[PDB]
């Protein structure tokens, strides 16, 4: 159904045949980033639920794979699995907790 990530297709009739108009999705403008497989926070290894960890140089964000939409790393979009002594390439960062400012106010 065409080259790229397929979205839709439309048929057209032709003599002794058929013509398909394949509508696809093609990524356009890439950008280099620094990435890590996991985030070490409080002695716990955090992995992204959906997406990928990226860094613009100073701060770390989590974004979806096919579109650069950076978001703050939070326990909602990450899950915890084990400690930091096993994963190769794990980096140190903080993970935001939404419950603490709601409890403080």
């Amino acid at each position: 159904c065409g080259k790229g990530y397929h979205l839709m297709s439309f048929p057209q009739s032709a003599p002794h045949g058929v013509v398909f108009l394949h509508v696809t999705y093609v990524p356009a403008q890439e950008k280099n980033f620094t990435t890590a497989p996991a985030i070490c926070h409080d002695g716990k290894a955090h992995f992204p639920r959906e997406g990928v960890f990226v860094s613009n140089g100073t701060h770390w964000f989590v974004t979806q794979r096919n579109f650069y939409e950076p978001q703050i790393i939070t326990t909602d979009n990450t899950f915890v699995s084990g400690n930091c002594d096993v994963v190769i390439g794990i980096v140190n960062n903080t993970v935001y907790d939404p419950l603490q400012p709601e409890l403080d106010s």
């Binding site: 080259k3 790229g4 356009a28 890439e30 990435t35 497989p37 992995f47 096993v86 994963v87 390439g89």
Partner: protein, 99 residues
């Protein structure tokens, strides 16, 4: 020595034509497909090739079959060793049996 079969085919009007792509060109295509698979994943077949580390690409592959990606990162050396052993088994089977 003696007359060949190919010479007797040639002398009677039967001719074998060479293919358009040589074996070096097929090897170039195969090496390009392998390098794009290793260094980009599936991204080079749907557009431009975007680099990704091979452990993270393999975690994407594990996530595609219904296994969480901490399973790869907590068992990375075992999976690498199993892959290397299976490639060596393919080497042994190709050097041993030709059927």
């Amino acid at each position: 020595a003696a007359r060949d079969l190919i010479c007797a085919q040639k002398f009677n009007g039967l001719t074998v034509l060479p293919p358009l792509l040589t074996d070096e060109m097929i090897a170039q295509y195969t090496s390009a497909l392998l390098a794009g698979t290793i260094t980009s994943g599936w991204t080079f077949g749907a557009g431009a090739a975007l680099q990704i580390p091979f452990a993270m690409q393999m975690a994407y592959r594990f996530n595609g079959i219904g296994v969480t990606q901490n399973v790869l990162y907590e068992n990375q050396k075992l999976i690498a060793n199993q892959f290397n052993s299976a490639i060596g088994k393919i080497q042994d089977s190709l050097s041993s049996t030709a059927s």
